[PDB]
Each structure stands twice: as C-alpha cells, then as structure tokens.
Amino acid sequence: HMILVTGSAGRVGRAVVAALRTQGRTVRGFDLRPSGTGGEEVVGSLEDGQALSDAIMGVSAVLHLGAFMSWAPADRDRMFAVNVEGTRRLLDAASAAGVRRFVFASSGEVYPENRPEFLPVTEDHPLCPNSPYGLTKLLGEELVRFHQRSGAMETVILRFSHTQDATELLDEDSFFSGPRFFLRPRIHQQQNFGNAAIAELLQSRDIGEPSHILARNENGRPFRMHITDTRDMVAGILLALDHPEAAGGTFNLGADEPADFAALLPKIAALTGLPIVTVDFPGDGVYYHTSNERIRNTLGFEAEWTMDRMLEEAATARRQRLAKEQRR
Amino acid sequence: HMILVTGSAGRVGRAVVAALRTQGRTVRGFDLRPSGTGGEEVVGSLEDGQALSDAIMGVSAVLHLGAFMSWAPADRDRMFAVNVEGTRRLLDAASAAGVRRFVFASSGEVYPENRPEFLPVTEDHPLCPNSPYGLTKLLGEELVRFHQRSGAMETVILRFSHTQDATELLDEDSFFSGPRFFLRPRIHQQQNFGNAAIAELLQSRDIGEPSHILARNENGRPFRMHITDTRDMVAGILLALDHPEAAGGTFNLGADEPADFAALLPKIAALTGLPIVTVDFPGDGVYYHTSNERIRNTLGFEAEWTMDRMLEEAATARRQRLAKEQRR
Ligand SMILES: NC(=O)c1ccc[n+]([C@@H]2O[C@H](COP(=O)([O-])OP(=O)(O)OC[C@H]3O[C@@H](n4cnc5c(N)ncnc54)[C@H](O)[C@@H]3O)[C@@H](O)[C@H]2O)c1
Ligand SMILES: NC(=O)c1ccc[n+]([C@@H]2O[C@H](COP(=O)([O-])OP(=O)(O)OC[C@H]3O[C@@H](n4cnc5c(N)ncnc54)[C@H](O)[C@@H]3O)[C@@H](O)[C@H]2O)c1
Ligand SMILES: [Cl-]
Numbered sequence: 001h002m003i004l005v006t007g008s009a010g011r012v013g014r015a016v017v018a019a020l021r022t023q024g025r026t027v028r029g030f031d032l033r034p035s036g037t038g039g040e041e042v043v044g045s046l047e048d049g050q051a052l053s054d055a056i057m058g059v060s061a062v063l064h065l066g067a068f069m070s071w072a073p074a075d076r077d078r079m080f081a082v083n084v085e086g087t088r089r090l091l092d093a094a095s096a097a098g099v100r101r102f103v104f105a106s107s108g109e110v111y112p113e114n115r116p117e118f119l120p121v122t123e124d125h126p127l128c129p130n131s132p133y134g135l136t137k138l139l140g141e142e143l144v145r146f147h148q149r150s151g152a153m154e155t156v157i158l159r160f161s162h163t164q165d166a167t168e169l170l171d172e173d174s175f176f177s178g179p180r181f182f183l184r185p186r187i188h189q190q191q192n193f194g195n196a197a198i199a200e201l202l203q204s205r206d207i208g209e210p211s212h213i214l215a216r217n218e219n220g221r222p223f224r225m226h227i228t229d230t231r232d233m234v235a236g237i238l239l240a241l242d243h244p245e246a247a248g249g250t251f252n253l254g255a256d257e258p259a260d261f262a263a264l265l266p267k268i269a270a271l272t273g274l275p276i277v278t279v280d281f282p283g284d285g286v287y288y289h290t291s292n293e294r295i296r297n298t299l300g301f302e303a304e305w306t307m308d309r310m311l312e313e314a315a316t317a318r319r320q321r322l323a324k325e326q327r328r
Numbered sequence: 329h330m331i332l333v334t335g336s337a338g339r340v341g342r343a344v345v346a347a348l349r350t351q352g353r354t355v356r357g358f359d360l361r362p363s364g365t366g367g368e369e370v371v372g373s374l375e376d377g378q379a380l381s382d383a384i385m386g387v388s389a390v391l392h393l394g395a396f397m398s399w400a401p402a403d404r405d406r407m408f409a410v411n412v413e414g415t416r417r418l419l420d421a422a423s424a425a426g427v428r429r430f431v432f433a434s435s436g437e438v439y440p441e442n443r444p445e446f447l448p449v450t451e452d453h454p455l456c457p458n459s460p461y462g463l464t465k466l467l468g469e470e471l472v473r474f475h476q477r478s479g480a481m482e483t484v485i486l487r488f489s490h491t492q493d494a495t496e497l498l499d500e501d502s503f504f505s506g507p508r509f510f511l512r513p514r515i516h517q518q519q520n521f522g523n524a525a526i527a528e529l530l531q532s533r534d535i536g537e538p539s540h541i542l543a544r545n546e547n548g549r550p551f552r553m554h555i556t557d558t559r560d561m562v563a564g565i566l567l568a569l570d571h572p573e574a575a576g577g578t579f580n581l582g583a584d585e586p587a588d589f590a591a592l593l594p595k596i597a598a599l600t601g602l603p604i605v606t607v608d609f610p611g612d613g614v615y616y617h618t619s620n621e622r623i624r625n626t627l628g629f630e631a632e633w634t635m636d637r638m639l640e641e642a643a644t645a646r647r648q649r650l651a652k653e654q655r656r
C-alpha cells in the first residue's frame with residue numbers, strides 16, 4: 001500500500017509525508033526538488049512522462065498536491081502544462097495502474113472566494129474562476145470528475161483554504177504572511193509584482209518605522225478571509241485518503257471561520273509590539289466566509305488550530321528568531 | 329470586419345465559409361489542409377503559436393470549429409493538445425487582438441446525450457461527459473466561460489447536434505452515416521474499433537447481400553437521436569455571429585426533433601431498395617431528445633431541413649453516383 005504524494009517538498013506536501021511516515025506507512029514523494037528528508041522520492045517534473053511512470057509504479061493511492069501557482073503571464077503556459085496536462089496524465093497513469101484512491105488538491109480560487117456570489121461559500125457555489133490559476137484548478141477538477149464517473153479509481157476533490165505554517169504568520173520574510181501583515185514587505189512585494197500605483201500608495205502610508213498593515217477595501221471594510229494551519233490541512237487530507245465516505249466526494253477544506261483583519265491585526269500587534277497602519281485599497285477587497293460543514297458532517301473533520309493557537313506559536317518562533325538577531 | 333473560421337476545410341467550417349463569402353463578407357480560413365476553394369486561408373495547426381498569430385491578425389470575430397475527434401487511445405494526447413490547449417491559446421490570442429466576438433463549437437457529448445439524466449436535454453442539464461472527446465469540449469467551454477466573465481470579448485457557446493451533409497446519409501463510404509445505416513460498413517467499422525463481440529454479432533446477421541441496419545437496444549427500443557443538416561447548423565452559426573442577443577449565450581444547436589430509427593430506416597430503404605436487418609445491441613442504446621428552444625426563442629432560429637428533405641437530396645446524390653458508376 002504505497003502512497004504517492006506529489007508536491008512533497010512543499011508546505012502541505014512535506015507535512016503530509018511526515019505524518020504518513022510517522023504512522024509507519026510506505027510513502028513515495030514526487031517534487032521538482034528533494035525534500036531534504038532523505039526519504040523515498042522522485043526528483044522530477046509532472047510534465048515528464050517518464051517521471052510520472054516511475055512515480056506511479058506499485059502505488060495504491062495518490063495525494064496530488066503538486067502544482068504551480070504564478071501571477072505573471074510569462075509563466076501561464078507552464079502553469080497550464082503543470083496543473084492541467086500534468087494532472088491529466090497523472091490521473092490516466094494512476095487509473096491504468098489500478099490506484100485505489102486519488103485525492104486532488106483544488107483551491108478556493110475555483111469559486112472564486114475573491115469574488116463570491118453568496119455567503120457562506122459552499123461546495124455548490126458556482127465555479128467561476130477569475131484568475132488563470134483558479135482556471136487551471138477548475139480544469140483539474142473536471143479531469144478528476146471524469147475519472148470519478150468512468151473508472152474503478154475513487155476520487156476526492158479538496159478545495160484548499162489559504163494555508164500557512166503557524167510560524168509563517170509573524171515572519172516578515174514569509175512569502176504570503178509577510179506582505180499580508182507587514183507594511184514594508186508588502187511594498188517590496190508590490191514593487192516586484194510591478195504594481196507601481198499600489199507600491200507608491202503603500203509607500204505614502206509608511207510612518208518612519210516598520211509597521212503592520214490592516215488592509216481594508218475602498219469603503220473601509222476590513223479584509224476577511226480563511227487562514228488555515230498546515231496541520232489542520234494535513235488532518236483533512238488524511239481523512240480524504242482513509243475515510244470511506246470521502247470517495248466520490250468534493251469538500252471545502254479549511255478552518256471553520258475566516259479571520260476579520262480588524263480583529264486579527266490588533267492580536268498580531270499585541271504579540272509583535274509593532275504599530276498598525278490602516279490602508280484602504282481601491283476595489284471591493286477581500287471578504288469571504290467558506291463553509292466546511294460538508295467535510296465536518298461527512299468525514300468528521302475537526303479543525304483544532306484556532307488563530308489564537310497559531311498566533312501563540314508564531315509569536316514564540318518570532319521571539320526565538322529575535323533572540324538570535326539580538327543574541328539575548 | 330474579417331472573420332476567422334477555424335476548421336474551414338471541414339464539414340461545417342467549409343459550409344460556413346462559403347455562406348459568409350456568398351454574403352460578400354471578408355473571411356480567413358484556418359485548417360491543416362487547404363480547403364480547395366482558393367480563398368484566403370492559413371494552412372496550419374492550432375498547436376502552432378505562429379499559425380495562431382498569423383491567423384488572428386486583423387480579425388474582428390472568430391468562429392472556432394476546428395477540433396480533433398478521435399476514439400483511439402494513441403490519439404488522446406493530440407486530441408487534448410488541439411481541443412484544449414489550441415482553444416486556450418486561440419482565445420488568448422483573440423482577446424489580445426481585440427476580437428469582438430468568439431463563437432465556440434461544442435458538442436452534445438458534454439452532457440452527454442448518449443446518457444441523459446432527463447429529457448428533453450436542455451442547456452441546464454448537468455455537464456458530465458463520459459468520453460475523452462466530450463471532456464475536451466467541456467474543458468473548452470470552461471476556457472470560453474473564463475473569457476466571457478473576464479475581458480471585452482463577447483463569446484457564444486454552441487453545443488452541436490450530430491451533423492451531416494444531406495448527401496452523406498445514403499453514402500456507404502461516409503464516416504458516420506455508412507456504419508449508422510449500412511450493415512457491412514458497420515461490421516467493417518466495429519471490427520476496426522476492436523469490439524469483436526459486437527462485430528462478430530453483426531457479421532452473424534449479414535443476410536448474404538448488402539443491407540441496411542436498424543439499431544435497437546436490449547429491450548428492442550430503436551435508436552433515437554438528432555441528425556441535423558449542415559445547412560441548418562450554418563444558419564445557427566451565422567445567427568450566433570450576428571445576433572446581438574447571442575453574446576454571453578450558450579445554446580443547443582440542432583434540428584427540432586430526433587429521428588426514431590424505426591421510422592427513419594424504412595424511409596431510407598424505400599429510396600435505396602436495400603433490405604433492412606433489425607439488430608438488438610447490448611446496452612441501453614442511443615435514445616435522446618435535445619431541446620433547441622433557447623436558440624429558437626432567443627435568436628429566432630428556425631431549422632429548415634426536415635429528414636425527408638435531407639433524404640430526397642441524399643437519394644438524388646446516390647442515384648447520380650450509381651449512374652456514373654454503372655455508366656447509365
Ligand atoms: N498554500 C496555499 O495557501 C494554497 C491555496 C490554494 C491551493 N493550494 C494548493 O495546495 C497544493 C499544495 O500547496 P502548498 O501550500 O504546499 O504550496 P507549495 O508551493 O508550498 O507546494 C507546491 C509544490 O508543488 C511542487 N511543484 C510545482 N511544480 C511541479 C512540477 N512540474 N512537478 C512536480 N512538482 C511540482 C512545488 O515544487 C512545490 O513543492 C498546491 O496544489 C496548491 O496549488 C495552496
Ligand atoms: N459532425 C458532428 O456531428 C459534430 C458533433 C458534435 C460536435 N462537432 C464539432 O463541430 C465542429 C465542426 O465539426 P465538423 O462536422 O465540421 O467535423 P470535421 O472533422 O469535418 O471538421 C473538423 C475540422 O477541424 C480541423 N482540425 C483538426 N485539427 C486541427 C488543428 N490542429 N488545427 C487546425 N484545424 C484542425 C480538421 O482538419 C477538420 O477539417 C467540430 O469542432 C466538431 O468537434 C461536430
Ligand atoms: Cl491581503
């Protein structure tokens with residue numbers, strides 16, 4: 001019963017592989033780069049037919065978390081090659097090899113949570129992505145649905161919440177949470193994204209010392225979104241892998257409730273000591289609630305990493321980091 | 329107002345092109361082979377980025393009919409490359425070029441009509457394709473829907489009925505109508521597919537001379553399906569190109585009612601003189617009605633080619649071939 005995990009060197013993938021191996025289960029990784037764990041893994045690409053064949057031999061179940069997420073147009077062809085065509089051929093290879101279950105990591109971008117038609121967003125919400133990435137995940141879901149209806153291989157679609165390791169939340173250098181909660185990282189981010197008007201706007205709000213940012217829309221409505229701990233995502237993925245009721249299912253996977261930035265930022269500020277700069281962005285901004293009621297009542301999923309628990313652990317890590325910079 | 333028509337060397341595409349040029353409109357073809365009309369056309373592939381950019385230059389509207397339809401596993405990669413990736417890059421090229429309207433040829437296999445969940449099949453029927461070709465067209469519609477919601481380009485999705493030139497209906501050597509209505513081209517077909525238990529069964533039913541076949545299901549339910557004249561499809565396509573109310577629309581495009589083979593076959597044999605063999609295939613067979621009410625009500629579509637009109641022309645053509653052949 002070997003389990004194949006693609007994206008096994010990534011945030012969610014590596015934690016899934018570690019949980020499985022801690023259970024003593026046989027796992028094979030599949031990622032562009034080594035995990036650094038020395039465990040069995042393919043180093044290679046989802047675009048490579050040879051790698052796909054090597055990866056699937058003797059495999060009983062597949063956790064397909066490997067995907068490319070990019071903003072720039074120059075990366076769009078690659079994103080479709082990896083996310084759509086890579087997923088298509090991985091499905092066909094899995095099916096032909098007699099894989100028993102295939103779990104697919106999708107995204108809230110298939111709805112999209114950035115522009116919902118109603119709240120809370122349920123699995124029955126229309127799938128109308130507005131980003132090329134979200135489009136790739138929708139096409140991916142459609143490939144999965146085809147195998148679901150047509151073969152012996154069981155499938156599960158899991159639409160991921162935005163996911164962070166707790167320690168990422170209070171790290172200015174983290175890819176997502178830095179720009180999300182800290183003003184200067186966001187300036188650098190937007191500069192690199194080439195969003196000139198935004199980067200100079202943010203610049204205009206800098207107060208002479210590092211600060212947090214409380215993001216709001218043009219009407220002063222604070223951003224609101226789900227941020228789920230990697231450990232809760234791992235728990236849901238293992239449920240999708242093992243629970244009998246997950247077969248043929250599609251589930252939102254994430255924490256119960258979103259974080260409202262008007263309540264989150266002062267909690268973050270209380271742990272960092274940094275002041276808060278409030279910025280009203282042009283547009284309607286971000287504001288969503290996503291229901292995980294289906295996965296809770298079907299698979300018995302229970303998220304346990306509340307923002308408070310996550311923040312408590314993020315803060316401890318930040319303080320240990322400082323004490324090295326500080327040498328205190 | 330240059331109109332690009334992909335698949336312009338094909339059954340529907342060449343007829344659409346001929347109609348547009350008969351109206352004195354400016355058209356550019358795009359297909360793997362020359363049409364043989366001597367009109368302006370790209371001879372090239374949808375897989376070729378260079379062909380795409382050449383084809384799209386100065387184009388104000390695109391009628392995207394070019395696609396690869398195959399059953400064989402060896403052809404599957406190219407069918408996805410042409411139908412999905414070709415469509416993705418054509419849409420992007422068209423949007424970037426300022427194309428005003430993009431019309432996409434989809435298929436009743438997106439439902440699929442070969443396995444409906446309710447009759448008559450309407451545009452709101454769920455999209456659950458069970459063939460890889462059907463899946464390519466569904467992925468194709470999702471690409472189009474992405475552009476519809478996004479940019480300035482108008483889109484129209486047309487789900488095509490099975491479509492024939494009238495003259496193909498009584499031609500043993502036509503790709504679809506030969507095997508549909510003639511026993512021996514069908515044996516020859518089912519063999520080449522590789523369905524021995526089907527071919528063997530048909531070969532056991534040969535009465536010693538060429539014959540028509542009347543296909544029925546296991547309970548003796550004769551097949552029933554829409555078969556639309558290319559000319560009716562062309563009329564629908566021109567409406568989708570021109571009618572203001574087509575923008576953002578999705579329409580079933582086909583004749584009003586399906587043909588019941590128990591009625592159709594005697595009419596066919598009354599024109600050919602050949603006997604009929606009634607064959608009961610294993611399975612639920614083919615049985616569907618598809619509604620064209622939306623396109624009739626919304627765009628004013630009226631189909632004009634009844635089966636009897638189609639057959640009269642098919643029979644005339646058959647007699648002309650037989651006459652040249654036997655030199656009479
Ligand atoms: N991180 C999030 O908040 C989030 C949100 C929505 C969806 N998702 C999806 O959940 C999955 C896992 O997310 P993550 O947080 O661990 O992101 P991640 O970037 O940390 O991990 C993705 C991994 O996939 C690998 N990969 C990329 N291209 C590959 C290729 N051609 N062949 C083999 N491997 C390749 C990457 O190397 C990477 O290790 C992804 O599919 C992601 O798109 C994540
Ligand atoms: N004929 C039917 O009953 C039917 C039913 C459902 C859907 N459709 C669809 O309606 C459209 C028109 O079909 P048709 O009846 O004219 O069939 P057709 O086979 O006669 O025409 C298809 C044309 O697309 C062209 N094509 C294939 N690959 C190409 C490529 N890589 N680059 C450029 N051109 C390429 C082909 O050369 C061909 O001429 C097609 O999209 C088809 O898939 C047809
Ligand atoms: Cl944000």
Ligand SMILES: [Cl-]
Nearest residue numbers: 375376377378
């Ligand atoms: Cl190319």
Ligand SMILES: [Cl-]
Nearest residue numbers: 508543551614
């Ligand atoms: Cl048939």
